[PDB]
């Protein structure tokens, strides 16, 4: 089947839970496929997840984002206009537990 996709300016929506490691950790723990690719492709972020500690998961998440960004900047300078996250899920979190 012939298909197409749109290219709106939503190229910057952090859809992979980049801004919310708490939610991403939760999704990953609940998702055996995603957690599996994660241990295959990214073992240091994965081991942080396996440990349960959101603090290490988040800490490594930022370190990985810095390392992604170092190379990604070189790639996006060539071309960058492909979104995949039409649902672009977001949440508002709070911790008013005293």
From Swiss-Prot:
Question: Can you say where in the cell this protein is located?
Answer: Cytoplasm, Cytosol; Chromosome
Phosphoserine modifications at: 7, 14, 36, 80
Output the superkingdom of the source species: Eukaryota
Coiled-coil positions: none
Q: List the disulfide bonds.
A: none
The protein's job, in short, is: Aspartic protease that mediates the cleavage of NFE2L1/NRF1 at 'Leu-104', thereby promoting release of NFE2L1/NRF1 from the endoplasmic reticulum membrane. Ubiquitination of NFE2L1/NRF1 is a prerequisite for cleavage, suggesting that DDI2 specifically recognizes and binds ubiquitinated NFE2L1/NRF1. Seems to act as a proteasomal shuttle which links the proteasome and replication fork proteins like RTF2. Required, with DDI1, for cellular survival following replication stress.
Complex formation: Homodimer. Interacts with MCM6; PCNA; PSMD4; PSMD8; RPA2 and RPN2. Interacts with RTF2.
| Family under the similarity heading | Belongs to the DDI1 family.
Q: What is this protein called?
A: Protein DDI1 homolog 2
Protein's organism: Homo sapiens
Question: Gene name, please?
Answer: DDI2
Relative to the complete UniProt sequence, the shown stretch is 116 to 212 of 399
């Amino acid at each position: 089947s012939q298909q197409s996709h749109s290219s709106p300016g939503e190229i910057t929506s952090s859809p992979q839970g980049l801004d919310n490691p708490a939610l991403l950790r939760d999704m990953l723990l609940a998702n055996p496929h995603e957690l599996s690719l994660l241990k295959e492709r990214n073992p240091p972020l994965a081991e942080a997840l396996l440990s349960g500690d959101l603090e290490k998961f988040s800490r490594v998440l930022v370190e990985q984002q810095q390392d992604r960004a170092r190379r990604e900047q070189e790639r996006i300078r060539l071309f960058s206009a492909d979104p995949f996250d039409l649902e672009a899920q977001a949440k508002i979190e709070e911790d008013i537990r005293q």
